[PDB]
Amino acid sequence: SGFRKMAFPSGKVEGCMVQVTCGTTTLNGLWLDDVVYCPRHVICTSEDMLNPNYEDLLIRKSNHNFLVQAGNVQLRVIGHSMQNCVLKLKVDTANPKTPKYKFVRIQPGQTFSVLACYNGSPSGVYQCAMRPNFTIKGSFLNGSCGSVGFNIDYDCVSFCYMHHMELPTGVHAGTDLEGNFYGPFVDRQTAQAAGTDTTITVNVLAWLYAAVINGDRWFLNRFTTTLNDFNLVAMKYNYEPLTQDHVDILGPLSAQTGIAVLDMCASLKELLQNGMNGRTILGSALLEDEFTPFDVVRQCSGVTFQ
């Protein structure tokens, strides 16, 4: 038992991290087979930051403008191209530690692990969720660009995020690995702001199920509600509305605890109206929304990976 903010083991990703330098700018790249992927803003200088023309900046570069280092070994850049907001650097050597991988775009509310890196060197791993406003609440310092987010599905690493920038509110924005931004953000140093965030309701419910599994039961009651009555209260508190699809997703947790989803929704409705009254749930005094139903099952039932 117990319940922690748990990330995926990062070994398979650590072997893909490289350092990319172009000019006076160094950041992180992702080396899979013979391609290194990195944010295209590595080719900007201080003059182009505010309004870069990336096609112009890239035409003015040659392969030898790009220094790629995998620890000590130097990788020779033999070609380069741009795919949306990522740069693809073709190198002379295929990464022998390339795992089975795919590129996937995730949806708001889903979680992934972040391998924070500096100078091509992995520094830490942590778990976060894609927020409904398409930002993540990450932990990143100067030099972290090109760090990646990923899930592990059996033996296969699913890359879903590459880090590009920090917004003024301290939250983070980036792209999928095909270079398409999450959210309405652009890779230029203008003043952009995230839209208003909401709480991920299906995730709060999954976490309450995790609490019941771990012996936290004080918030339960024998009332039941309907989808439409619950969604009416949720809207007032800036909670995402609950769909029948969400109810089905919560099936395994309802089955294992014998508490129906709409029963659990009645508990959540009370918590939103009366608060917690100085009581905690799984060691938190706030309702937690960064665990998916799958995260809970994985941690309260125990799937491994190859």
Ligand X SMILES: O=C(c1cc(=O)[nH]c(=O)[nH]1)N1CCN(c2cc(Cl)c(Cl)c(Cl)c2)CC1
CA 161/CA 179 separation, integer angstroms: 9
Query: Which of a copy of itself, ligand X, none does residue 125 bind (CB under 5 to 8 Å by kind)?
Result: a copy of itself
The answer to whether 274 contacts a copy of itself (rule: CB under 8 A) is: no
- Strands 73-75 and 77-83, bridge-based pairing: unpaired
Q: Which of 187, 240, 288, 295 is close enough to bind ligand X by CB under 6 A?
A: 187
Question: x/- contact string, 133-152, with ligand X (CB under 6 A)?
Answer: -------xxxxxx-------
CB of 243 to ligand X, least distance (A): 33
- Count of residues for the chain? 306
The answer to whether 165 contacts ligand X (rule: CB under 6 A) is: yes
CA 29/CA 92 separation, integer angstroms: 15
- So which residues are the catalytic ones? 41, 145
Question: x/- contact string, 82-121, with a copy of itself (CB under 8 A)?
Answer: ---------------------------------xxxxx-x
CB of 150 to a copy of itself, least distance (A): 13
The answer to whether 125 contacts a copy of itself (rule: CB under 8 A) is: yes
Neighbours of 214 (CB within 10 A): 15
Backbone discontinuities in the chain, residue before each (C to N > 2.5 A):
none
The answer to whether 185 contacts a copy of itself (rule: CB under 8 A) is: no
Contact 103, 159 (CB under 8 A): yes
The answer to whether 188 contacts ligand X (rule: CB under 6 A) is: yes
- Strands 148-153 and 156-166, bridge-based pairing: antiparallel
Query: Which of ligand X, a copy of itself, none does residue 128 bind (CB under 5 to 8 Å by kind)?
Result: a copy of itself
CB of 27 to ligand X, least distance (A): 7
What is the token pair recorded at 60?
């003015």
CA 288/CA 168 separation, integer angstroms: 24
| SS3 label, residue 5 | coil
> Which residues lie below 8 Å from residue 185, measured CB to CB, with a gap of 6+?
134, 164, 165, 167, 173, 192
Phi, psi angle pair for 102, to nearest 5°: -150, 165
Q: Which of 107, 123, 180, 238 is close enough to bind a copy of itself by CB under 8 A?
A: 123
Give the binding range for ligand X (CB under 6 A) out of 77-85, 106-114, 185-193, 277-285: 185-193
CB of 109 or CB of 138, closer to ligand X: 138
What is the token pair recorded at 82?
């741009």
**Residues within the interface to a copy of itself (CB under 8 A):** 1-12, 14-15, 115-119, 121-128, 137-143, 166, 170-172, 214-215, 280, 283-286, 298-306
